[PDB]
C-alpha cells in the first residue's frame, strides 16, 4: 500500500 515514501534513505 505505502511506497518507499516511508523515507527509505538507506541507513
Amino acid at each position, epitope marked *: *500500500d*505505502a511506497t*518507499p*515514501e*516511508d*523515507l*527509505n534513505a*538507506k*541507513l
Partner: antibody
Amino acid sequence: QDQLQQSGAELVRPGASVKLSCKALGYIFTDYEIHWVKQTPVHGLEWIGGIHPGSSGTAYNQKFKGKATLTADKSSTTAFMELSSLTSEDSAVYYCTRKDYWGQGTLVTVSA
Amino acid sequence: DIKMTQSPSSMYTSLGERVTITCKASQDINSFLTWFLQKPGKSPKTLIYRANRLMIGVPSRFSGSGSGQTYSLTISSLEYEDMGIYYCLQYDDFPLTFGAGTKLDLKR
C-alpha cells in the same frame, strides 16, 4: 499481505546476549528499511536503529551504538537485532517496524 | 533531535464523539509522520502514514492533516474499538522520535 513476525519471548541472564529476529512477508524485503523500537513502562518508546536490507545500510541511536547490532538476510527476508551485556534495564518489549507495519513484539526479561 | 510535543496528554471521550489529537514538531518534518494506536498488552497498529494517507484496512473515520510542524489526527466518530493510546511518529530525520501520546478513556 503486510507482515512482520518476531521471534518468541526471551529469558536471559545478566551479562549475556540475545539475538531477536523479524521475518518480513507480503512485500519486497529489499525496498524498505526495518527499524527496531524499545518500549518499557518507565521509559516509553525508544527508537534503537534502522537497516536497509537492500543496501545493508544502518543508522543507530547514539544510546545503542555498541550495544545493539542490526543485520538483515536477503534469503530469509529476516531482520535481526542483537543486544549484548544485558542488564535488567534491557528487560523490555522490542518491536520491529516498517514505519507503517509493526511486528507483534518480542518480550525480553533479564533476570537471575 | 526532533521533539514531538503531543497533546492533549489525556482525553476523556464519549462514544460517537469527534476526537482531535495534535502533534507539534520542534522543526519542519515535511509530512513524514505516522499516527498509530496501541492497546494494553497489544502491539502498535498504524492508522495513517505520511501525515494523511489512510492505512489499508483502517476505517475512513480516521484522517490526518498537517504540513510543516503541526499535524493532527482526527477521529470523526469514536467507537469502542478505538480506546487505547494514540501516538505520532516522525521519521523525517534520525533518530526517530515519538510523541508522548494521548490516552483516550470513556467518560462517566
